[PDB]
Design an enzyme around this catalytic site. Structure first.
Site: not given
Ligand code: 19S
Length: 274
Positions: A14-15, A127, A20, A41, A17-18
């Protein structure tokens, strides 16, 4: 609230960033593809692990309709609700044609209450940005990404960070840029920039970056001079005047002259109704 690792089944990223990542997994104890989806995460260093443990305890202690929901841990990993609509930044960019000023004002209000709840918990987010706001439903958003979040000590109302910030410079308050000072009031600065993101629909061509390059030596220092001079981002196209005024109020040079989240909320609710 405790998830066995073997029942957590990887699907996709999903993502990133720094230090993690967040992954889509299925929590699938039956092993049959029928379990619920969750966002997980994890880290990918001695100190990042400590920070990660702190990020979990902070999110575990948060309960609000406008903050991404903690589900549990697996031992090393943080389990959260999965919001398929992804981040507000992409949602805005994709659904521009359907979201009018009211909707944008509804989002702003929801983020504001969320930030008001964080402040009441003594939590500085550090942030705030549309990329870190998740979309629950077409009319419901939630603040996410607590990887940088700090708990203010009872005796202080600001926090000083030793090492430089690693997020885009255009969201930082001037005192964060010059002195690494973060407080609930530097969060109000960043919230002003989030408002700017909403009302441009995170359009790339009038993003903070693009706007800074147009106004014109190290970029971090240039930005400081510009803000010191009283330069600010322009009213987004078709932006209601009262909403732009709110941005400028969030962008007051001195943290004490910025309005609180509790003052902002009422005003956004009134504009939403107006
Ligand atoms: C913002 C953070 N996302 C989360 O903590 C999420 C919790 N439930 C979610 N459901 C869908 C999504 C989609 C956007 C990817 N994200 C999340 C994240 O992805 N990131 C990127 C990697 C490091 C931490 C911040």
């Amino acid at each position: 609230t405790i998830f066995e690792e073997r029942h957590l089944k990887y699907i996709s990223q999903l993502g990133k960033g720094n230090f993690g990542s967040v992954e889509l997994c299925r929590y699938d104890p039956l092993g049959d593809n029928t379990g619920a989806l969750v966002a997980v995460k994890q880290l990918q260093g001695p100190d990042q692990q400590r920070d990660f443990q702190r990020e979990i305890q902070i999110l575990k202690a948060l309960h609000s309709d406008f903050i991404v929901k903690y589900r549990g841990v697996s031992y090393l990993r943080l389990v959260m609700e999965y919001l398929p609509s992804g981040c507000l930044r992409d949602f805005l960019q994709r659904h521009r044609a359907r979201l009018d000023a009211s909707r944008l004002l509804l989002y702003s209000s929801q983020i504001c209450k969320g930030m008001e709840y964080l402040g009441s918990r003594r939590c500085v987010h550090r942030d705030l940005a549309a990329r870190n706001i998740l979309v629950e439903s077409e009319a419901h958003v939630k603040i996410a990404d607590f990887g940088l979040a700090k708990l203010l000590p009872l005796d202080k109302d600001y926090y000083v960070v030793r090492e430089p910030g690693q997020s885009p410079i255009f969201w930082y308050a001037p005192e964060s840029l010059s002195d690494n000072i973060f407080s609930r009031q530097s969060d109000v600065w960043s919230f002003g920039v989030v408002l700017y993101e909403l009302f441009t629909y995170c359009d790339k061509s009038c993003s903070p970056s693009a706007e800074f390059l147009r106004m014109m030596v190290p970029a971090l220092s240039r930005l400081l001079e510009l803000l010191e001079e009283g330069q600010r981002l322009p009213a987004p196209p078709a932006c209601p005047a009262e909403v732009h005024e709110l941005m400028k109020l969030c962008w007051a040079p001195s943290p004490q002259d910025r309005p609180s989240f509790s003052a902002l909320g009422p005003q956004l609710d009134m504009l939403w109704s107006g």
